[PDB]
Amino acid sequence: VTPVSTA
Amino acid sequence: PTHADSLNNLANIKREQGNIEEAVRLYRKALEVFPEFAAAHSNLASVLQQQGKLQEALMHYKEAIRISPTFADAYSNMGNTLKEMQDVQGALQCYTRAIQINPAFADAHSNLASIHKDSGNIPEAIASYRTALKLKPDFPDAYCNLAHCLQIVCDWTDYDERMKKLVSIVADQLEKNRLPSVHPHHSMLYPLSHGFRKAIAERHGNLCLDKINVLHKPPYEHPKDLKLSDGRLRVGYVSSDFGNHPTSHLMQSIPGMHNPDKFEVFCYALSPDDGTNFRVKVMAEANHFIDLSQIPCNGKAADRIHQDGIHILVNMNGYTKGARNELFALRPAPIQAMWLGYPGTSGALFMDYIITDQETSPAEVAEQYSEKLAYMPHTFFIGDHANMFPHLKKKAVIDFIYDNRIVLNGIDLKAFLDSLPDVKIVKMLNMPVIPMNTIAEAVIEMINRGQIQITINGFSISNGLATTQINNKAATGEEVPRTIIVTTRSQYGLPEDAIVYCNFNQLYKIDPSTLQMWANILKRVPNSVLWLLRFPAVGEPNIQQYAQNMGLPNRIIFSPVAPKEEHVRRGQLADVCLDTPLCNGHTTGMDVLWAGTPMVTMPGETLASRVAASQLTCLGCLELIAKNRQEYEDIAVKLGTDLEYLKKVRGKVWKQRISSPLFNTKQYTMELERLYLQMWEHYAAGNKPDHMI
Ligand SMILES: *CCCOP(=O)(O)OP(=O)(O)OC[C@H]1O[C@@H](n2ccc(=O)[nH]c2=O)[C@H](O)[C@@H]1O
User: Where does motif Nuclear localization signal map (chain B)?
Assistant: First the structure.
């Protein structure tokens, strides 16, 4: 639900 | 058969070298000589998977298993292919089958651990990685992935020993020219040298170069002037994150604010349309929008870019999820620049510039980066907050005078306040104060009862906890709220009569040193609390315990992760934000400043550790930047005790979020445009890339 900056 | 073994063994070595085309040819030769060669099928499948030929890979994994039904490694690797196809059920069925066949098979446990982590099951991922390491104690991939899992939940058992071992693992892998087990995006979290971080990045960039070399493409011919484009510089923004993602929340207004007399904007999406207004806006406002998710072959996708005639191709992913840096390895444009989405160097020769600034990336540390520095004049950071959350430009309060106990925001706030009998205006430009009367009591009652909304004098008054029930697009930041929203400390269990320090970052950005600084601040400021997020919830008891051991008595209050608009709005309830020095709030930094909340930071050496200082410098609040840990503590404690000084600093942030360049997307775009023309004119005169200040 909460998009984040990820590898 | 023995002839087939020699071909297979050679293929395996060719693959390790990155000679993918030759590896495939040899595996196919091995199968021609010995058709029932299970290992050859499985190895061929693995290289086909690497090339993105997922159905062909599957076919060969199944052939390997038909030949040898107990081939656990085939099932394990087939699982990875199914995971890449978004078939999590199929992936778990394969991993669990592999582990059933051979419970001592470390690689399978490690693959299972990864899918647990990706699914949001950190405790099971930890357990499966520990099984892998018990079975194979020298397993760099599993150790480093475990280290990140432990980081995510703030498990700091043997932290310093763990950090030393991570550095040791990287040294050893770099010395043997293997792909390092630490991911480039994670490298800023660990005490690695700048050389080691750059080298990690370079080796990951080289994986893309190996993949494109199969295609046998000549260098593309690049424009030498702007003749074919009517004197317009053609800029291509490449991103997997045109949609509901922090990067769109930063830059969705930029494409549309480009000067069409001098620029032609192409947006290359690497992701399909997610249905959100973020994607709608970039599609509507870019001069051209190209969905490269429909073109999975990187050769044809890179041709698609070269036809369009791009001058500057901008890499907004770096080594984040959804990247297709194979597109950049092919060099379809003459100038290729890293911008915004990735807080680090690519380490790659195929990227020419990194768009940064003097505060984030000072000239001293230019060896940290493989690219040349291209400075924006204030900060390279930008946020779309003025467009997304204009209801937070002004606020009112209810006097139960505090600016952050009970807060109202809304586009129609002025009209609502004008309908009320005895509103007091406090000069700061100004803050309206609703005195404790019947209307203020109606609002407080809505909040206390947990009601969704009420009506006062015909105005819609919404409970800030209920935004998704009122307008889900307003909750996500896709639409501006059309009601007046109420936000209170009591909604989050925060104290009415004490200082609230906040940090709204994912918990992985906190380390032992940081929590020790925060504890020291809290001990110096009686009754104050630290407000953190359940990001994720399984990190809470670790934080609370380590804080207990440092001497903190209910001084840390956790709240759930909120929808975007609520997250930004509730930052108005804090007095001060305490930034994470290991890796700063980036988007989260902009969020807190938009609420008018001062942020204390300590810039480090990495790009990721200096963004908050750059934001604050652009904002014009140099007094919030600490040079060492003592200064960080002293600044934070002064803000929590000297209440006139706090009022002054908060007033400064509140005004300067509008008057400074920080949230001014038009000014930013124009400055970015000047930088693009410098880059272009430098190249058009036959020069190679050089630093730009
Ligand atoms: C690509 C880096 C983005 O910046 P960063 O500050 O590192 O933020 P991430 O952790 O990658 O993403 C956080 C993401 O979540 C939003 N948020 C945070 C907290 C909350 O309760 N609700 C949210 O909606 C932030 O706004 C940010 O977009």
Answer: 164-180
- Count residue pairs from A and B with Cβ separation < 8 A: 25
Half-sphere exposure of B179 (CA within 13 A, CB side): 13
Q: Is B279 left (phi over 0), alpha (psi -120 to 50) or beta?
A: alpha
Cross-strand partners of B578: B600
Identity of the amino acid at B564: K
Mutation target to probe the A interface, by most A beta carbons within 10 A, among B320, B472, B478 is B320
Resolution of the solved structure (Å): 1.7
Query: What kind and span of H or E run contains B338?
Result: strand B335-339
Q: Within 10 Å of residue B542's Cβ, how many Cβ atoms?
A: 18
Q: How far apart are CA B684 and CA B508, in angstroms?
A: 44
Put simply, the answer to whether A7 touches B506 (Cβ < 8 Å) is: no
Per-residue CA distances from B394 to B6, B402, B425, B659 (Å)? 74, 15, 13, 14
Length of chain B: 693
- Which of 3.30.720.150, 3.40.50.150, 3.30.70.660, 3.40.50.720 would CATH assign to domain B385-492? 3.30.720.150
In CATH, the number for domain B500-667 is 3.40.50.2000
CA nearest B562 in A: which residue? A2
H-helix or E-strand spanning residue B369: none
Sequence-distant contacts of B521-525: CB under 8 A, at least 24 apart: B521/B578, B521/B633, B521/B636, B521/B637, B521/B640, B522/B552, B522/B555, B523/B551, B523/B552, B524/B633, B524/B637, B524/B640, B524/B641, B525/B499, B525/B637, B525/B640, B525/B641
Amino acid letter, B115:
I
B275 burial type by CB count under 10 A (0-12 exposed, 13-18 middle, 19+ buried): exposed
Q: Give CA–CA dist B440/B486, Å, rounded.
A: 11
**Cα dihedral B630, B633, B634, B639 in deg (nearest 10):** 160
DSSP label at residue B180: P
Q: Which of B320, B561, B587 sits opposite A6 (nearest CB)?
A: B320
Write out chain A residues lying below 8 Å of B321, CB-based: 6-7
β strands within B49-151, DSSP E: none
- Token pair for B293: 């998710």
- From B118's Cα to the closest Cα of chain A, the distance in A is 11
Topology alike, domains B385-492 and B500-667: no
Q: How far apart are CA B232 and CA B412, in angstroms?
A: 42
Most distant CA pair in chain A, distance: 17
Q: Using alpha carbons only, how large is chain A's radius of gyration in Å? A: 6
Main-chain dihedrals φ then ψ at residue B185, nearest 5 degrees: -55, -30
Residue to mutate, B564, B565, B580, ligand 1, most ligand atoms under 8 Å from C-beta:
B564
Q: Looking at domain B227-384+668-685, does it have CATH number 3.40.50.11380? A: yes
> Cis peptide leading into B536, omega within 30 of 0?
yes
Query: If you measure CA to CA, which chain A residue comes closest to B476?
Result: A2
User: Mapping DSSP to helix (H, G, I), strand (E, B) and coil, where does residue B457 land?
Assistant: coil
Task: Tell me how far the alpha carbon of residue B357 is from its chain's centroid.
Answer: 19
- Cα dist from B15 to B68, B183, B495, B548, B582, whole Å: 23, 21, 60, 51, 37
